[PDB]
Design a protein around this ligand. Sequence first.
Ligand SMILES: *[C@@H]1O[C@H](CO)[C@@H](O[C@@H]2O[C@H](CO)[C@@H](O)[C@H](O)[C@H]2NC(C)=O)[C@H](O)[C@H]1NC(C)=O
Ligand SMILES: *[C@@H]1O[C@H](CO)[C@@H](O[C@@H]2O[C@H](CO)[C@@H](O)[C@H](O)[C@H]2NC(C)=O)[C@H](O)[C@H]1NC(C)=O
Ligand code: NAG
Ligand code: NAG
Ligand code: CA
Ligand code: CA
Ligand code: CA
Ligand code: CL
Ligand code: CL
Ligand code: CL
Length: 609
Amino acid sequence: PEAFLLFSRRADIRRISLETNNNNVAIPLTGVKEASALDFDVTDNRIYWTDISLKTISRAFMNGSALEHVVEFGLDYPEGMAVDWLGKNLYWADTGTNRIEVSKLDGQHRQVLVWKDLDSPRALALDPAEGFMYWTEWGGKPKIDRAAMDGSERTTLVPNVGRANGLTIDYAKRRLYWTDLDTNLIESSNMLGLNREVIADDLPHPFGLTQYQDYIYWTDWSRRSIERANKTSGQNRTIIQGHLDYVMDILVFHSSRQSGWNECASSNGHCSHLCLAVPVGGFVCGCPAHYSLNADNRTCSAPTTFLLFSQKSAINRMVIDEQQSPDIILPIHSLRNVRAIDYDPLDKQLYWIDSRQNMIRKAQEDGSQGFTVVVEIQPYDLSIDIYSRYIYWTCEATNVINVTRLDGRSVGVVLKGEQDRPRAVVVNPEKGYMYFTNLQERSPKIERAALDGTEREVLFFSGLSKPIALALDSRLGKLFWADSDLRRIESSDLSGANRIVLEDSNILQPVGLTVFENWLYWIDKQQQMIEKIDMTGREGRTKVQARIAQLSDIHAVKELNLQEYRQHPCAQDNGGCSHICLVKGDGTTRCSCPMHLVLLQDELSCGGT
Ligand SMILES: *[C@@H]1O[C@H](CO)[C@@H](O[C@@H]2O[C@H](CO)[C@@H](O)[C@H](O)[C@H]2NC(C)=O)[C@H](O)[C@H]1NC(C)=O
Ligand SMILES: *[C@@H]1O[C@H](CO)[C@@H](O[C@@H]2O[C@H](CO)[C@@H](O)[C@H](O)[C@H]2NC(C)=O)[C@H](O)[C@H]1NC(C)=O
Ligand SMILES: *[C@@H]1O[C@H](CO)[C@@H](O)[C@H](O)[C@H]1NC(C)=O
Ligand SMILES: *[C@@H]1O[C@H](CO)[C@@H](O)[C@H](O)[C@H]1NC(C)=O
Ligand SMILES: [Ca+2]
Ligand SMILES: [Ca+2]
Ligand SMILES: [Ca+2]
Ligand SMILES: [Cl-]
Ligand SMILES: [Cl-]
Ligand SMILES: [Cl-]
């Protein structure tokens, strides 16, 4: 097989033949803005690249076909990237997010492997046959680190270096090569970071490096060239190609650079998701972010409970766990201005309002199955009745509470009055009630009504100025709200009894709130904070996360007890009801209708007028 050298420069990935240096061509890719890190896969001759301007990681065949973005969310500066050709994983280092991550080569099952005490990780190199990965860190005190390829047993391998790049392993000879931008040289060590030897010096900015057979190849920005030298002696130096300024990466493309074996074998180690190499020649089964590995050490389980929080253009998920796993961005396309979110735990689908396009949309957490539920309306807030399978939502333009089935079929309006201004809304189908803020002129109110709009009552009319967020927790039997003018968070029993102020200090702009276990979580848009308060009163107010821009909503997802769920009388085929099914205070469950219809004598069906 003829070996080739690939390199990135500007928006191009170019190929040079190491047998005939004159032959230089561009790989036929479209849509590239800035080609950065490069790699390939020996199995199928796909090329992989990062684009630090577009914030993506992509792949394609060398003929340009099957071009796809395998990572396109939650990146900032993906400067390091490598293919694990044995486990069939993609690894990357993001200098902006300070994370080292992994996924399958097609982008599935993304997981964060390193995220704590990480300062500008840059050049990544993998040794899947041995089960170790290596990377450089710039930032405060530059160093080269090593970890197992599942992220475990992280150590500093080389503590005394300048800003290092082009980290490359000679797998045949068991040596690690890198460039040093500050000491102005290329050097190598053994795999333990010992027996260091300078190969070439007087290189003001050796930015890229690779190795093939007896030669190293590098590019120095001051020389504007790609050069080659003997890897051991540093002699026999020649120019491969000149007049190449600011080359970002170089890669020897040849099958001998992706050899060896490991115990993942041809079966992904029988791991359900990720097969991650660990020393020596072995593996562990890995899981997507927030999943847990089952007792069998092979299969993964999705998180049973988590918190969602939205920004203007992102929906994020976080978990509370012993590892303190990091928050992730959900890969949901076409977000523009997310105003409010909800989640259906039965079908595992995220719902949101987008205020740019005035729509209610849904998708799976992995981004698939995107669908428009409601589309001059102006949705403000939404709340899912997970038993009856419909969404209650407020319209800021017509000032109604409308009800729409999850599949988009309208049920109809349950609240409308000439002076009514329904805004925040939350349903409690366990008891048959909905709760809403009513921002009536000169008299804001918190109200409730049965889920068909009957039995309307004002719970609170005093001590309200701009109640902007509303939440409830059926287990605690409590209602919660936040006022952005009085700058406080309050609570009461769901009946309206026992109103209390939870917090009235250091609140600026409390735009959402949610209950997770015994904690009330809220988001403050101005302070850019998620914070929590302990409802048992034992622990103090605690900061959860800071510096989150454009916060819009927060939503806790409890674990769904499927047996309890199916015991809800509206859970089986909407209790036989054509429109609304609801629990009543007298202990019965009944069918009812939106405002334009009446219940017929069968007590199941609604008819006109
Ligand atoms: C581009 O290159 C790829 C990889 O060499 C080609 O993919 C093959 O396509 C054929 C028929 O379409 C299949 O039988 C093979 O299974 C594919 N191979 C792999 C590794 O995926 C693709 O055909 C090429 N495209 C062009 C236009 O030449
Ligand atoms: C409540 O929302 C539904 C959408 O879920 C609205 O239904 C639309 O009504 C318009 C005319 O008013 C029709 O052109 C559309 O075809 C309807 N869409 C669907 C999916 O049925 C309904 O108008 C809303 N009701 C109120 C009172 O605002
Ligand atoms: C590289 O240098 C080493 C040490 O001097 C020598 O043994 C080897 O033959 C050289 N290889 C090439 C390809 O020049
Ligand atoms: C799973 O691995 C753990 C150690 O991580 C070990 O104690 C246990 O025996 C393993 N269980 C199975 C079923 O392989
Ligand atoms: Ca590289
Ligand atoms: Ca320098
Ligand atoms: Ca809500
Ligand atoms: Cl050292
Ligand atoms: Cl009151
Ligand atoms: Cl809530």
